[PDB]
Each structure stands twice: as C-alpha cells, then as structure tokens.
C-alpha cells in the first residue's frame, strides 16, 4: 500500500518547491459524469484470498 504524495521529480533539474517543469505530483482524479456511457461508470471490485 502506497500513501505518499511527495513531489515526483521527472527530469534532471532538481525540484524542491511546487508545480514546475519536469516535476509533478502523482495523484490525478477520475472523471465520473452522468453523460459517460459504458466503460466509464463506477465498477465495484471485491477480492477474496484464501
């Protein structure tokens, strides 16, 4: 399980502050509008392990 959201440096230029080039934060939100048809509706997943 990963929970972190610290700034992800992509390029070789060091990034230590906020939104900038070649450094972004990972999380990006799902888009769930009523207009979207099949393939974009909430699917509920349950996994059982023994």
């Amino acid at each position: 399980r990963d929970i972190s959201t610290e700034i992800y440096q992509a390029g070789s230029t060091p990034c230590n502050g906020v939104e900038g080039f070649n450094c972004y934060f990972p999380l990006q939100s799902y888009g769930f509008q009523p207009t979207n048809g099949v393939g974009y509706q909430p699917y509920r997943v349950v996994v059982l392990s023994f």
Partner: protein, 48 residues
C-alpha cells in the same frame, strides 16, 4: 534526449507513444509535418 531535457517548449506530450523514452524502440520512414499558427489556436493540437 535533447528535446526531452531542454526546457524551452510548451507541449511535449505525445498522443501516440509512451513518453518514457523512444531511443530504445525502432521504426522506419519517420514522418513529420510542420506548420506555423497564430497563438490563439494552440488548442487544436490534439486528437480529433
């Protein structure tokens, strides 16, 4: 690599291929179409 590292652009996100790295995969007969536009239609460079 020079295009990736050099920070002088405004859009370098490829709609066709993964932006990880392309110096590894091999293709043939590279295509490239260029033009000049006014600054107001910068939103047209997208699939569709």
């Amino acid at each position: 690599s020079v295009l990736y590292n050099s920070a002088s652009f405004s859009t370098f996100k490829c709609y066709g291929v993964s932006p990880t790295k392309l110096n590894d995969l091999c293709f043939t007969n590279v295509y490239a179409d260029s033009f000049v536009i006014r600054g107001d239609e910068v939103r047209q460079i997208a699939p569709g």
